[PDB]
Each structure stands twice: as C-alpha cells, then as structure tokens.
Design a protein around this nucleic acid. Sequence first.
RNA 1: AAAUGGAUGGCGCUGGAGCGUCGGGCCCAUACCCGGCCGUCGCCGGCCUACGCCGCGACGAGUAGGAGGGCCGCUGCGGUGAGCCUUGAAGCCUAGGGCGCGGGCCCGGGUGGAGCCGCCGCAGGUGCAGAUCUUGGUGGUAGUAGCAAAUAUUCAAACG
RNA 2: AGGCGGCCGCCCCCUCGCCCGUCACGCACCGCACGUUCGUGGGGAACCUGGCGCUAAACCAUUCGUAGACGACCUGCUUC
Lengths: 109, 195, 129, 63, 153, 50
Amino acid sequence: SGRLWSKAIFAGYKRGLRNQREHTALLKIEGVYARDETEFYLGKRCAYVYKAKNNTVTPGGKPNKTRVIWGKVTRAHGNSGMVRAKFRSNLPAKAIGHRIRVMLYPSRI
Amino acid sequence: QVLVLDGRGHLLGRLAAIVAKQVLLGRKVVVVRCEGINISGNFYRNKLKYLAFLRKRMNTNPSRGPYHFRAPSRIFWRTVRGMLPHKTKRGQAALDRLKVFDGIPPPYDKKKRMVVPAALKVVRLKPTRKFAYLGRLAHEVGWKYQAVTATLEEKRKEKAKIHYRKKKQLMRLRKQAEKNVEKKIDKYTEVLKTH
Amino acid sequence: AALRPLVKPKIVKKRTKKFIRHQSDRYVKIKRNWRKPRGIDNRVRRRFKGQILMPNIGYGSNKKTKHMLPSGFRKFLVHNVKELEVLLMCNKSYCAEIAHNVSSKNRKAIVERAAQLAIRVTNPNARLR
Amino acid sequence: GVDIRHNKDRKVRRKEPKSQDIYLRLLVKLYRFLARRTNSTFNQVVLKRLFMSRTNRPPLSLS
Amino acid sequence: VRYSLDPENPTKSCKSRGSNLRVHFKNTRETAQAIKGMHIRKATKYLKDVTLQKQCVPFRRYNGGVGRCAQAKQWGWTQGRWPKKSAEFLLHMLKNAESNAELKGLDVDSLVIEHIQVNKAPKMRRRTYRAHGRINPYMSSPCHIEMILTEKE
Amino acid sequence: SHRKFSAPRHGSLGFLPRKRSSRHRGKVKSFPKDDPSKPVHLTAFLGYKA
RNA sequence: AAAUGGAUGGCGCUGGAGCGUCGGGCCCAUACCCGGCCGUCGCCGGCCUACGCCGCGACGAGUAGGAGGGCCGCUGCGGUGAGCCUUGAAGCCUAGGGCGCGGGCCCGGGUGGAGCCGCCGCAGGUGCAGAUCUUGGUGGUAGUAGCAAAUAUUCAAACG
RNA sequence: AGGCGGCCGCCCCCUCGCCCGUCACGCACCGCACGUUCGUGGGGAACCUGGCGCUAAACCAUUCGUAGACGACCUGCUUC
Ligand SMILES: [Mg+2]
Ligand SMILES: [Mg+2]
Ligand SMILES: [Mg+2]
Ligand SMILES: [Mg+2]
Ligand SMILES: [Mg+2]
Ligand SMILES: [Mg+2]
Ligand SMILES: [Mg+2]
Ligand SMILES: [Mg+2]
Ligand SMILES: [Mg+2]
Ligand SMILES: [Mg+2]
Ligand SMILES: [Mg+2]
Ligand SMILES: [Mg+2]
Ligand SMILES: [Mg+2]
Ligand SMILES: [Mg+2]
Ligand SMILES: [Mg+2]
Ligand SMILES: [Mg+2]
Ligand SMILES: [Mg+2]
Ligand SMILES: [Mg+2]
Ligand SMILES: [Mg+2]
Ligand SMILES: [Mg+2]
Ligand SMILES: [Mg+2]
C-alpha cells in the first residue's frame, strides 16, 4: 500500500514565444523549486494516467479502462526547478494543468 | 486541492500574478477578504484611474461592450482575467477553477486561510509610500455594500475570538498534560531525533 | 506468417500525409492532387509558417526502404502464369499482385501456382466462390 | 547559406556521348576501360574525342 | 422500386409512394417532419386539425419570413403555418398506405409512421412579365413522397 | 459639422430602455427606509383608477 | 489644448515589474556542431541492366526567365505480351489496404454490360481555378418581395 | 452560499480501540507497467422486493380589452 510515485504537474510543451516543439514537454514537479534541487530527478520515468472507454490496459491480471503514455526525464529546465521530459508518444494537449506520475525507478539511490 | 488565501495586506498585481500562475497548474485557489487588498500609490490616483476606466465605454451601445464591475471581488476577477488567456479554453478553465469572495463565506470561516509572503504590503513597499484600500475604493465608487460586509465581518471576528479562547484553553490543558510525567522515554528519542 | 521475407529494417517514411493542395478544402472543383502554385501573393509559395507544406526533395525515403510494403516485400503486378513464373528466382523479396481484370477462373489457377512456387501474393482470397 | 561563392555546379563537360551509335558506344566502353586502367593520356584524349560531338570532330584531309 | 431506409421486415410494414405531385417542397417537408414518429390515427386527426386550422405545423428549417402563431407552443417552437394543400395530399397518401396495409393483411389499428421522405421532383416552368420588357422564370416545386408504416408492439 | 443651431435633445436616455413591462401591476423598486423611533405602519396599498 | 472609448501590447507595477551602471544563471531560429535519410555537383573504383553497381567529400531558398529528368497523364498509329476478360472490359462511387516527395498509380468492395491495357518507337486539336471565360445545370436570396389604377358584392338551389 | 461536530442516559460486545518482546502461518504467482485512494466517484434508461405517502398543472381552443403588426400581455367559465 501507499503511493510510490512523486507528484508532478504537466505545464506545457517546449516552446518559444510563437512556435512550439511538441517532442519535449515541461513538468512543474512538487517539492523541487531550485536548479540545484532538480538533480535527483534526472533519469526518473514518468507516466500520464488517463481514461478511455475501450478495454486496453497492462496485462497485470485484470482488464480495465486505464491507458498510460510512458516516458522519462531528459534534463532540467530553468532556475525555478521545472523539468524537461520526452515521452514515447507526444502529449494529447488535454493534459495541461493535470498530473503526470514520476516513479522512483532507475535513478541512482 | 484548494488554496484559501487571505486578502488583507496583499498587493493587487503581486497577488494577481501569483494566483494567475498557480491557477493555470490546476490548484483550485480562492482569494477571500478581497476588500482588504491594498494598492500602492495615492488613493486619489487609484480612484482617478478607476474613473478613467469607467469613462472607457462603447458609445454606440454601452451594454454591448465594456462591463464595469464595482464590487472588489469582481475587480480582482477582472484583474486575473486580464492576465489569463481567457479567450482560449485554457484560461477559461482557469477562470472556472478560480473563485473569489468579498467578505468570508461559511466554509472559509471554517477552513484556515493562507497568506502569501511575496505579495504583502510590508514586504513589497517602503513604509513611507502611500497606499489604498480596494474596499474603500469600491465603496467610494459604486459598490454600496461596505456596511453589511463590515457588520458580518465583525460578527465572524467575534466568532473567531470565542473559538480562539477555547482553542487556547485546550492548548493550556495539553501543555499541562505535557508538564505531567511518564512520557519521557519516547521524548528522549524525540529530542535526540528533533523534538 | 506466410512466407517471411529477408532482413528488412524499420521502415520510416519521414512524413505520411500525401500533401494536400492549397484551397482544396474551400472549393470542391479542386481535386486533392498536389499542384505547385505559381502566384505572386501566395503564402504557400512564400513559405509562411502555419500554412501547408510543399513537397520538396527532402522528404525522399531511404533507398533501402523504398517501395516497401509493410509486410516486407516489393509488389509486382501479374496477369497470368508466365508472368507469375518469372518471379521464380526472387520470390523472397518481390511479391506478386494479381491484376484486377483477371477473372476468378484463371485467378484460382494463378494463386494455386503461386502457392506451388511459394510466391507471396497480396490478394489471394479475393473474388472467390 | 554557407558558401558565399557563386554556384557553378556542373562545369562544362559531356560525359556520355549523345550519339546513339552502338559501335561508337562500344568504342566508348573500350577506350573508357583503357583510359581508366592503363594510365595512358593518349587513351584519355582519344576517349574525350570520342565523347566529342559531330561538328567538333572535323574531317581530316589526306594532304 | 427502391426506397431509403428499408424496414426491419416487409411482413410487418407497408409502403407508399407518390410521384410528381403539385405541392410545395418546403411545405411538404415541414409537415412531414411533424408527421414522422406518430401513430396513424393521431396523424389523421392532426392533419384534419391542420385543414381546420386548429393545430399548426411548425416551420423549423424553411422558416424564412414565416409569421408566428400561438399554436406552435405544443412543438416548443415559435413559428407556424397551416398547409391545406399539403395536408390534403399527405392525408390522401396516408389513406393509400392504409389501403396497402389492408391488402397486405396487417393489424391496421397499430401502425406508426417509421420513415417518411420528400425530395424535389423536376419542376415545371412558366414565365412572368417584369419591367423593361424582360422575361423571368416562374417555376413550381413538386416533390416525390415515400412513406413506411410499421406495426408497433 | 458645427451644427450652427444647437437644439436640446429629444427624449430621455434614462427612460430610453423602453419595453412592454413584464408586470402589469406596477411593482415597487424601493420602499422608504425604517427606524425604531417611528411607530409601526405600512407603506404601499393597491388602487384602481376610477 | 481635440474632437467615438483606449492603449509602455494589456493586466498591473513604487524595499520596483521605473531609471543608470553591472555580475552569475536561465529560454529559443530553418543560425552553428555532431548524427540519420533524399537530391545535385565534384573526384573516383570495377571486364556488374555499363544508360547498371558501388566509394568519398562539399553544398541544397528563390518571382521573371533558362535547361535536365519523369516507370506522371490523355488520344490515336506501327511493332510487341500464345496479354486480360460476359466465371464480367471501359466508366463511376468508396469511414478499405498500400506505394511514390510529387505528377499519379496498384489492389479490395458495390453498380455496370463490351470493349480494354503493359513495354519500345511514332504523331498530337494532349493536362485548367480564374479570362465582367462560352454552353448547360443547381443553391443562398426565399416560401421573401409581390398577386392594391378604374365604388361591390350577397343568399338559396342545380350539375357535380 | 448551513449538515458535520459536542453533552446526558441506554443499546450487542470489546477489558488486542495502542508501544516493546516470543511463535507460526496466510500465493513465496519464481526481475518487471496502468498497484494501492474520499467510489455503496456524476447523471441518464430499465430489472425483483419491504415500509411510508402522493392523486395535479401548463399549452392549444373559446372569450376578453386595461393590450394588441403577428406572436406576446391582463382576463371569465359552477350548475348557483
Ligand atoms: Mg510579392
Ligand atoms: Mg494577391
Ligand atoms: Mg546549407
Ligand atoms: Mg432574415
Ligand atoms: Mg413578417
Ligand atoms: Mg410584372
Ligand atoms: Mg432595487
Ligand atoms: Mg499604461
Ligand atoms: Mg534596469
Ligand atoms: Mg532551387
Ligand atoms: Mg496505364
Ligand atoms: Mg487546345
Ligand atoms: Mg486528334
Ligand atoms: Mg472550370
Ligand atoms: Mg491560374
Ligand atoms: Mg463569368
Ligand atoms: Mg437561382
Ligand atoms: Mg414583408
Ligand atoms: Mg407576401
Ligand atoms: Mg347542395
Ligand atoms: Mg352535389
């Protein structure tokens, strides 16, 4: 029991002022508010949990209504502690203002 | 979840910047006591700028056009409207997540109110600069509800005093309990590991 | 899982949109085929951002993965038994595809000869009885 | 771009002979092989003159 | 002949078609949208009320410049009009569909109107006489009508 | 421009939002204020213009 | 001091989100470096469609215009496929599968009923988005304007 | 812009409602993801059952003129 993943709010794509680059996303992760603090999360793996009405899940026992686009942290971003992340597929852009799980695997504890 | 913010002693643009940044991420923030939000500068200048804002109106039809709110909660809500992308369905969802109240509602009388240190008058102003009250501005121009809000505010302040005396009595009782004995075996461990 | 051709890598196409013609949405007299606009005011020719993209040489697919079906073969059209038997030497890279005007009576003989010679055919089970 | 110089991509040359004479193409094949395999600048010049046109190969006279 | 929206089964369904009949296409479409999805006796009483101007027909799509009525509040709409000629023709085709159901041997008291279709017949042309010696067309708009009536259980 | 004969304006902007009123009985927009010094009484009645 | 209400972009900003001097980080363009792929050009290899096959390197924007390639396409002619078919050709439709970067193409499914196509050469009345383009058809307008020059009709019956 | 909390007396039990020590078990599913949560999550259409109750009102039609371009608005209708 108990949550094993750290909370991180999706903030938006990597962008300029005008144009965007949808292959890289930004994460405001809670607790981290510093460039020196966003060092431990380099290499963590992220997961966007969302819902659909067709029966497609992981084969861990039971078929359900939960879909996940996987991905992982690439590097840090800015001085405020925001974190870049490249997922395996690009974001649906509905995920703005929603939470992406950051699970505590392969990093170097 | 919800972020219940006090409005006393905060500056309008600083609090609007912090609220408009924290509402785009999804944290449902509610600014309570909006009549106490201060504005730097002279109060004559602030009501002159608000009178100029009232003077801005469409001449061919004043109804179809600029809607000039006089209530201070709606003043702060227009202030955050001008900072969020409200023409898009990101700032529209952010304005749906944002709630604002003049005076204090009963659930926010119940819950605890936060205070943002970066938006404070004392933090952001040299103490010999002039300031204003948004409730004073709203009563001086349009919003005719200062007396009822002040009466209900004094009523809930009396309620808060009669709750605080009970809470402080319970805290004196629990420190008498901490003054009593047969608890120290765990307390040595807690002092050695940050009491 | 029929014939499993030789080592074919990950096939990428570098875009898969078959680029639309400008203002084909606005007028239905304009077919969806690409046609290079040669106007003096056109945003597509001037290559403004946010407009459609013109097909140029940079979208060229790899020569290793050129004309590649997703099964891993390259298609070759066939009318009859001699043009099916010409695929006898390279049957593990160049698959057969029966022409549309071939009747069912000869089509069953062609697909039986392809099953004998172990030549992949794209449409074996079409126009049967 | 990168190159500030002008772009003269193809220089001048005629590599394949434009004539469809089969015998001339066979001589082109043979003397191309000899020109790249013998280090003979005679074979180089004869291969270039076989690439050369009808007008630019003027008729020699017997005298 | 073929229709649109072929029924569940031809045993429990009758059919009717009128072709090249002098009405307005817009009036017959807007009354067919009110006929559709209704019991046959309710539709017959409704069309008699239309011919007696006691219950109207709401114009929902072809509502350009159509005056209002108080009777359209049954339909949740504001505008209405009372097509006498369209009501007479579609009542005659409802009687024809009733006779076809009687010939096919259906339980004639429990028919609902499942499908109705109205589409533009080739219109016939006459001419006006406008100013400055000009001739302008004066064209009709007849329609083809199909209807399917099905036993409701 | 410069109309050369300035006239007072026709009508009134304060009465300009003209409409068939949804009420037929003229409702009271504002009653007079109260005080504990005055005795108990009513303010408004109904009538019919004979 | 200027005429509709309005512009440091707006919101706001005073221990600055203003001014002047600056420091350390941070954000990105089709700019630069590394790498994958296409094409052009240059230099080249081989006695493996020689008009094919590889090798290395540098560069690719562009109206008017000028060239090259097109296994892009339409029509007909000579050769050519012991070509295709009434066990279904052309044509048309298609929330189907695919290829090419594109000109376009191949197959699946449905109507259709008698002609059609691949390759090498040949010859064009050979490609449409416009020209107040020509002919034909069809919408919004729209069940709208309109059926108002000259005093006027009414009851009953009959054929229906 | 109110619905959970506090007191008295009973109800069927708990003297493990907790911290430290002993013992043995529960799937040990043999390297792997979306697992654990306020969920007897929001609303709509129906299925079988207990208890307690409910028995109407709009719109059209007719009339009305205090209003009406048409809609709309104010109105009457009982068997005294
Ligand atoms: Mg220009
Ligand atoms: Mg122009
Ligand atoms: Mg370059
Ligand atoms: Mg209109
Ligand atoms: Mg009208
Ligand atoms: Mg006329
Ligand atoms: Mg009032
Ligand atoms: Mg300003
Ligand atoms: Mg500065
Ligand atoms: Mg170029
Ligand atoms: Mg062809
Ligand atoms: Mg021509
Ligand atoms: Mg000709
Ligand atoms: Mg045309
Ligand atoms: Mg043109
Ligand atoms: Mg024209
Ligand atoms: Mg027309
Ligand atoms: Mg009119
Ligand atoms: Mg009219
Ligand atoms: Mg009679
Ligand atoms: Mg008679």
